Amino acid sequence: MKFTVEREHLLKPLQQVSLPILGNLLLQVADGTLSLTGTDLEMEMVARVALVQPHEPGATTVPARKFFDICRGLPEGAEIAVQLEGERMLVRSGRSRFSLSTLPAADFPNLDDWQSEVEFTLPQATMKRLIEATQFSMAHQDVRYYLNGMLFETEGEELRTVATDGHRLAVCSMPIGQSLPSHSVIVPRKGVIELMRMLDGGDNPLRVQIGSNNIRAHVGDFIFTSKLVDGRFPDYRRVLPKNPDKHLEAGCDLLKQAFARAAILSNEKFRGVRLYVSENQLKITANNPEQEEAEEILDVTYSGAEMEIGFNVSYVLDVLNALKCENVRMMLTDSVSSVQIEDAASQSAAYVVMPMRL
Amino acid sequence: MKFTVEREHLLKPLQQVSGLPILGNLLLQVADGTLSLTGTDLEMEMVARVALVQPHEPGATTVPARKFFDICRGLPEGAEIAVQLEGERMLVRSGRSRFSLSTLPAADFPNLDDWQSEVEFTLPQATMKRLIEATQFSMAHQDVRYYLNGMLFETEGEELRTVATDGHRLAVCSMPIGQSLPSHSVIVPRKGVIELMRMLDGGDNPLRVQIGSNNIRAHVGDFIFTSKLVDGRFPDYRRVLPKNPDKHLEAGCDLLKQAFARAAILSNEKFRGVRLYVSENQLKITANNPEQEEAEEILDVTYSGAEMEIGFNVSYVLDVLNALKCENVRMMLTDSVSSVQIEDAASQSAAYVVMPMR
Ligand SMILES: [Ca+2]
Ligand SMILES: [Ca+2]
Ligand SMILES: [Ca+2]
Ligand SMILES: [Ca+2]
Ligand SMILES: [Ca+2]
Ligand SMILES: [Ca+2]
Ligand SMILES: [Ca+2]
Numbered sequence A: 001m002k003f004t005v006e007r008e009h010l011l012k013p014l015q016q017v018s019l020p021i022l023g024n025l026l027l028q029v030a031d032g033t034l035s036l037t038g039t040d041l042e043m044e045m046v047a048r049v050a051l052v053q054p055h056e057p058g059a060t061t062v063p064a065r066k067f068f069d070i071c072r073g074l075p076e077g078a079e080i081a082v083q084l085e086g087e088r089m090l091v092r093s094g095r096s097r098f099s100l101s102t103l104p105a106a107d108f109p110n111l112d113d114w115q116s117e118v119e120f121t122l123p124q125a126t127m128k129r130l131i132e133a134t135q136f137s138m139a140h141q142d143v144r145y146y147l148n149g150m151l152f153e154t155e156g157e158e159l160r161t162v163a164t165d166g167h168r169l170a171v172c173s174m175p176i177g178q179s180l181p182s183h184s185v186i187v188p189r190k191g192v193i194e195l196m197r198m199l200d201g202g203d204n205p206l207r208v209q210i211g212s213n214n215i216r217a218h219v220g221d222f223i224f225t226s227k228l229v230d231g232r233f234p235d236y237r238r239v240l241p242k243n244p245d246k247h248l249e250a251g252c253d254l255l256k257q258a259f260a261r262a263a264i265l266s267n268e269k270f271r272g273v274r275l276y277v278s279e280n281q282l283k284i285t286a287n288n289p290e291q292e293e294a295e296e297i298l299d300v301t302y303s304g305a306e307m308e309i310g311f312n313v314s315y316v317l318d319v320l321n322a323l324k325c326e327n328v329r330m331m332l333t334d335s336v337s338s339v340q341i342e343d344a345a346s347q348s349a350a351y352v353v354m355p356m357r358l
Numbered sequence B: 001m002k003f004t005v006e007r008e009h010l011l012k013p014l015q016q017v018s019g020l021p022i023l024g025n026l027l028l029q030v031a032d033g034t035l036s037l038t039g040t041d042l043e044m045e046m047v048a049r050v051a052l053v054q055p056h057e058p059g060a061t062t063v064p065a066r067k068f069f070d071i072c073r074g075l076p077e078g079a080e081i082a083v084q085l086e087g088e089r090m091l092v093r094s095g096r097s098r099f100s101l102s103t104l105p106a107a108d109f110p111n112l113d114d115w116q117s118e119v120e121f122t123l124p125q126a127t128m129k130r131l132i133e134a135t136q137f138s139m140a141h142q143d144v145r146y147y148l149n150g151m152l153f154e155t156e157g158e159e160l161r162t163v164a165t166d167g168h169r170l171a172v173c174s175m176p177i178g179q180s181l182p183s184h185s186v187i188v189p190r191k192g193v194i195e196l197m198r199m200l201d202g203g204d205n206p207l208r209v210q211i212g213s214n215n216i217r218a219h220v221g222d223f224i225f226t227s228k229l230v231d232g233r234f235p236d237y238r239r240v241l242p243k244n245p246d247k248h249l250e251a252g253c254d255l256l257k258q259a260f261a262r263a264a265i266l267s268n269e270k271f272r273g274v275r276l277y278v279s280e281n282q283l284k285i286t287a288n289n290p291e292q293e294e295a296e297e298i299l300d301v302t303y304s305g306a307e308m309e310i311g312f313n314v315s316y317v318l319d320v321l322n323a324l325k326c327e328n329v330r331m332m333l334t335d336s337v338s339s340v341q342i343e344d345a346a347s348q349s350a351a352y353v354v355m356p357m358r
Helices: A007-017 A064-073 A124-137 A189-198 A252-263 A313-323 B007-018 B065-074 B125-133 B190-198 B253-264 B314-323
Strands: A002-006 A024-030 A033-039 A043-050 A058-063 A079-085 A088-093 A096-101 A118-123 A149-164 A169-188 A205-210 A214-219 A222-227 A246-251 A272-278 A281-287 A293-299 A307-312 A327-332 A339-343 A346-353 B002-006 B025-031 B034-040 B044-051 B059-064 B080-086 B089-094 B097-102 B119-123 B151-156 B159-165 B169-176 B184-188 B207-211 B215-220 B223-228 B247-252 B273-279 B282-288 B294-300 B308-313 B328-333 B340-344 B350-354
Touching (some): A002 A007, A007 A033, A007 A043, A007 A064, A024 A064, A043 A189, A058 A064, A058 A096, A096 B253, A118 A169, A124 A149, A124 A169, A124 A189, A124 A313, A149 A189, A169 A189, A169 A222, A189 A214, A246 A252, A252 A272, A252 A281, A252 A293, A252 A327, A252 B065, A252 B097, A307 A313, A313 A339, A313 A346, B007 B025, B007 B034, B007 B044, B007 B080, B025 B065, B044 B190, B059 B065, B059 B097, B065 B089, B065 B097, B119 B125, B125 B159, B125 B190, B125 B207, B169 B314, B184 B190, B247 B253, B253 B273, B253 B314, B253 B328, B273 B314, B314 B340, B314 B350
Antiparallel strands (some): A002 A079, A024 A033, A024 A058, A033 A043, A043 A222, A088 A096, A096 B294, A118 A205, A149 A169, A214 A222, A246 A327, A272 A307, A281 A293, A293 B097, A327 A339, A339 A346, B002 B080, B025 B034, B025 B059, B080 B089, B089 B097, B119 B207, B151 B184, B159 B169, B169 B350, B207 B215, B247 B328, B273 B282, B328 B340, B340 B350
16 A cells, blocks of 8 residues: 655545544545544444645545644645555655554454435535534433434424533524425534534535435545434424514624622522513622622613513523524513523524523 | 722732632722732732722722722723722712622721832843743742752852752753842742733833742732742752853744654653754654654754764653744753753844753
């Protein structure tokens, strides 16, 4: 196995593809192409790079981090010559020489073979929007294992993501211009993060294939495959407040800064803040067990009945930071119901926070 | 106690002083048209003075430092901040943002012992920055020899000098300050060095230093920092500089750094040993690890001395090269079992000594 490639043509693939063999990358030279594969047994990334210089076929595995670090450590645009020599992989560029340990390509694990059952193509930016809108609301390491990921749902002509930690919920729906079967799957949280970072911000379309227990995403030279979480996800429809009758609109940043200052004097563990809404005015209060107290008053747009409501300010600040927009809509019912929060200029993403009695 | 100040006048002082629960509080004192703000940990103290141009009333209190800072920082650009002591709370008002903070009595706030200045001088901020940055990385970390955990500040002739060492490597930097100084040495603890550095805003305000038998004080602008000193017998750098390191090697600093950095990837993860082979206008760096992986770097250098080999902890060498912010480095060698001296090829202001490895 032999190949010579420019440093930069390896770095992006290396970043994407990054028991001992799990710490190695599979390298394969075949039919004019170097393939690089990383895996943790749950998910796998394959990156292809065209070989324009002379090369010789073959396959091995090499320590991922050390190989990455050597390549990154070489000078910008350096030529990197790689060949197998015995049980070692030789790396040479200029007068820099490296000899790395190998493990047999035969020992590199494959994900189980599977069949694609639902497929669609969408712009990368659309998938990025869907994931970014909801990612922060996934659970991390909850005993409810099915919350440690993101629901991907197809319905009519749209793709939807849902994330919840069992306390707050995020949902985002986007039309993708293709007739889809009604379907939903759970992508493990590590898989969501890996998928997100494979999206490079460019013009390559994204092709998604979903099987019974797997998902695959293809963008340009990269192919990501993950197991799905085998479980049942909560129904977001039952979480959204039914027909909320009271709408407040305010500048996102003004609202966020008011909440952020109030949060300083909220309970450190439970983070409860109170809202008092009246004609075109919002008052936010916070207090803590040391009996310190914050109050914020700001102009908003509101004409409904006067009401009060408490919430976890961390959850609300999470929403406002995710929204990054000009204006926000808080959809209210009463002191004993959840709130729905949206970009005032878009119904694509919605966020639900539970009420607190303070 | 009442004052009204522009946010912009409070922020930097609050950051500088904020950097027994009462140790979590700032002492605020309005007296003679000045607001003073003090923070302490019993070992060191920062005091900031703020001119009060708006109406004010005298008195003193203490308030939670982080909360007060976070509230002020959280307020908008150009906010006016009105503050008044009411009963046992401190009221903070700006626009329609209101905050009530807990207090502890000013009478409870601890003072450093009184002391007399024995040695005094003035120096540009840029000189103190240079002295600290040139040596700081070489201080010990939690060594049982406590004095090695800090930094020696030495006056000799008209020079101020810093020395830092952990027994394995040493840094020394000397700078002229244009004043006849006594011969004197003190050891500033780690945290004091960090603060000394933090107080240098980079402007044209000179620094005034006062040294007592057990304290150091630095005045810059409207800030006064005071630290206790560290007792103990700090090693003499003059005994550590090789007596006659007459084998001189010169090489590009970044070229040398990046070669060591690549070689380091395949060095022992705990011991970090690399080997240097010096010969006529050539340096070869090698590294190997228990897994029998190997790196080799060959660089052109300027060297006319006799051939020799020497082993080093590569992290120590990299630390030096990263601290040398320059074009060319000089390495001054003795033999395979003696320390190396390293300097900027174009300046003798700082020197670095690294012990060899067997
Ligand atoms: Ca280039
Ligand atoms: Ca629908
Ligand atoms: Ca569906
Ligand atoms: Ca294009
Ligand atoms: Ca209040
Ligand atoms: Ca010197
Ligand atoms: Ca070695």
